[PDB]
Amino acid sequence: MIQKTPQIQVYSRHPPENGKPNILNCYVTQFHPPHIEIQMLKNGKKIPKVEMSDMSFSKDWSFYILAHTEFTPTETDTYACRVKHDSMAEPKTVYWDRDM
Amino acid sequence: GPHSLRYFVTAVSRPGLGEPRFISVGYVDNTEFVRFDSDAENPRYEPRARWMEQEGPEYWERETQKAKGNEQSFRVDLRTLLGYYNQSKGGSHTIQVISGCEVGSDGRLLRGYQQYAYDGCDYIALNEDLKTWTAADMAALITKHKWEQAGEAERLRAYLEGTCVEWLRRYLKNGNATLLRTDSPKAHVTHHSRPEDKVTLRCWALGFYPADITLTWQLNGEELIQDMELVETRPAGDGTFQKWASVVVPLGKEQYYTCHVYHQGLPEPLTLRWEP
Amino acid sequence: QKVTQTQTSISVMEKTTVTMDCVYETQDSSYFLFWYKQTASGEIVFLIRQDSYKKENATVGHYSLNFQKPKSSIGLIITATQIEDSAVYFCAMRGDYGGSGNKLIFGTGTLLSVKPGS
Amino acid sequence: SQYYYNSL
Amino acid sequence: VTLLEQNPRWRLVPRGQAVNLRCILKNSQYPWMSWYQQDLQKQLQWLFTLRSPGDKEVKSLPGADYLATRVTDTELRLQVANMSQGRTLYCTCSADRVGNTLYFGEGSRLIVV
């Protein structure tokens, strides 16, 4: 009967090579119900094209899904992952930290 | 060694927005190998792993019609619970199920099981003995008593000990080769600003599989148990995983700290230092 | 899915052992065999069931089954019959998967006639 | 092979 | 002391006249209801299984075109049309989806006159 808030984790597939193309992943887990809206920004943008893995759940009943969108890092390119879910009041968005 | 075949089932309702979404995912040794999503156009029981494509269309049609049938009973159960709990019909809800068996290298049954959950809370489970049930609230008791009165456990058991096992046997033969795949991690360390009399060293391990790995830092042989920053092993979105760990060491003292990586794929636990 | 009962009719004296045959067909690994009775009034009555995954023959009242999984046979055995047992015995198997459950497949039916003593 | 789930 | 209440108990009708049968569940523990046909040769055959209020379905066996609906949690209906030969319809209830515990009602003997 209880709702579980998401755990976001945005990171690159390969190490961020400025200028060179890469895949930006936004891993979301520990949530419930499974109704969730995931979107990836870009200096506040909203990259329309964003592939989303199928959803599954862990033995603790919570769901987890993987979203991504091919991109290219630049010194002044902002990236985030905005996530709306019934557990949180306002969409907790987390920015991509090349170092993490 | 030991193996297991499991099925993770979800049935989630979308009030006055269509029928409930039904999904049944199949796993062998924690590896998804089959799937069925009702929200797919013309739903089919798709093979998730290559080594599964070697099954006849007869199997695929059988399992597809099985799911469709289950999707139906589930559509009913959702409404039944709705009434056990006296919940408005307008709200959405979820039923999840985990069913399967885990067999030992000897081919013998180590543990069979079946658990239900309603909205993320355990509903009813089949006990160790494969004979009795355990209800987790007034509602589950009803299902419990009915299933007692109907021999459900006996039927279910029969499935866990036999059908479920044999099929685990068959799937493994056609795909053990693949299930053995292993990718050793590649590790490098990074130095970070961290303004002050200190600095952060991050030990990265990337492109490894399975997801099982352990990363640890040491100071002149002794191990670090405090202020270690770790991140849940994450999927690289390409079949492999990655994970890191960091510590803020006093500047200059960089060399005195070493990172360690243990992974079943590696021929031996590699050791990192960070090289300027 | 061809459950068949070859006997059109069986007439035997009361207090006698009578065995009504039933051969069946199913691909399912697990399944259920049944035996029902219908009387002149026209009402069906459940008699006994068999569970495919139980190596031993089921038993209820004076009814008994000769379950022989390897020979897909599951006859009914009525012991110490009487003037009330006289009815039409149907043999049924629950089996197909999904659109079944409550979908039993019944046999052609066999009319038992228990002849009294006087 | 999937299990034929019954009713809650 | 009986689970289902089937009506009408019998019916005499001229070939072709449509007939409406009704079945009433008098016990909430057997919500799984179904229709069975028994032809003049005493052969039983399954027709429908409707569990949820709203479920409608049609089928056509030789001799009769049917149409059953699970109107409410306690009322299951059936509509026999274009009947050419006699047949008696049985309403059945069962505890759950699996079945294995289905009880037959008294029937609706339909006779072609």
mmCIF file of C-alpha atoms in Angstrom, chain C residues 48-103:
data_model
loop_
_atom_site.group_PDB
_atom_site.id
_atom_site.type_symbol
_atom_site.label_atom_id
_atom_site.label_comp_id
_atom_site.label_asym_id
_atom_site.label_seq_id
_atom_site.Cartn_x
_atom_site.Cartn_y
_atom_site.Cartn_z
ATOM 1 C CA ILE C 48 -15.114 -38.361 -7.435
ATOM 2 C CA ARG C 49 -12.030 -36.712 -8.987
ATOM 3 C CA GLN C 50 -8.510 -37.820 -9.824
ATOM 4 C CA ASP C 51 -5.379 -35.688 -9.806
ATOM 5 C CA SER C 52 -2.883 -36.539 -12.564
ATOM 6 C CA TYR C 53 0.016 -35.938 -10.221
ATOM 7 C CA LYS C 54 -1.048 -38.463 -7.582
ATOM 8 C CA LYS C 55 0.276 -41.968 -8.209
ATOM 9 C CA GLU C 56 -2.456 -43.470 -6.007
ATOM 10 C CA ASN C 57 -6.083 -44.093 -6.960
ATOM 11 C CA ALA C 58 -8.613 -41.663 -5.512
ATOM 12 C CA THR C 59 -11.337 -42.876 -3.139
ATOM 13 C CA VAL C 60 -14.726 -41.541 -1.912
ATOM 14 C CA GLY C 61 -17.940 -43.264 -0.750
ATOM 15 C CA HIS C 62 -17.866 -46.698 -2.391
ATOM 16 C CA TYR C 63 -16.464 -45.193 -5.553
ATOM 17 C CA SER C 64 -12.871 -45.965 -6.576
ATOM 18 C CA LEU C 65 -10.763 -45.230 -9.592
ATOM 19 C CA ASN C 66 -8.256 -47.386 -11.439
ATOM 20 C CA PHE C 67 -6.002 -44.560 -12.556
ATOM 21 C CA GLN C 68 -3.374 -45.909 -14.941
ATOM 22 C CA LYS C 69 -1.535 -42.838 -16.197
ATOM 23 C CA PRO C 70 0.655 -44.834 -18.622
ATOM 24 C CA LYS C 71 -2.490 -46.253 -20.285
ATOM 25 C CA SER C 72 -4.559 -43.057 -20.084
ATOM 26 C CA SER C 73 -7.271 -45.099 -18.378
ATOM 27 C CA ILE C 74 -9.371 -44.066 -15.410
ATOM 28 C CA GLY C 75 -12.350 -46.329 -14.938
ATOM 29 C CA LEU C 76 -14.916 -45.987 -12.219
ATOM 30 C CA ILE C 77 -15.440 -48.785 -9.693
ATOM 31 C CA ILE C 78 -18.791 -48.918 -7.973
ATOM 32 C CA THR C 79 -18.785 -51.510 -5.163
ATOM 33 C CA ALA C 80 -21.935 -52.873 -3.458
ATOM 34 C CA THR C 81 -24.146 -51.224 -6.060
ATOM 35 C CA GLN C 82 -27.860 -50.676 -5.502
ATOM 36 C CA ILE C 83 -31.192 -49.460 -6.857
ATOM 37 C CA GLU C 84 -30.070 -45.862 -6.348
ATOM 38 C CA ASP C 85 -26.732 -46.133 -8.165
ATOM 39 C CA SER C 86 -28.686 -46.830 -11.345
ATOM 40 C CA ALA C 87 -28.054 -43.719 -13.460
ATOM 41 C CA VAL C 88 -25.933 -42.487 -16.353
ATOM 42 C CA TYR C 89 -22.271 -42.175 -15.514
ATOM 43 C CA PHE C 90 -20.265 -39.607 -17.360
ATOM 44 C CA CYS C 91 -16.474 -39.456 -17.343
ATOM 45 C CA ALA C 92 -14.823 -36.075 -17.837
ATOM 46 C CA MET C 93 -11.373 -34.585 -17.991
ATOM 47 C CA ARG C 94 -10.498 -30.923 -17.427
ATOM 48 C CA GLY C 95 -7.937 -30.026 -19.987
ATOM 49 C CA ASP C 96 -6.854 -27.528 -22.578
ATOM 50 C CA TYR C 97 -5.030 -24.550 -21.130
ATOM 51 C CA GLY C 98 -6.268 -21.000 -20.638
ATOM 52 C CA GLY C 99 -9.769 -21.078 -22.105
ATOM 53 C CA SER C 100 -10.317 -24.215 -20.015
ATOM 54 C CA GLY C 101 -10.304 -24.379 -16.214
ATOM 55 C CA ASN C 102 -14.095 -24.505 -16.055
ATOM 56 C CA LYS C 103 -14.062 -26.287 -19.444
#
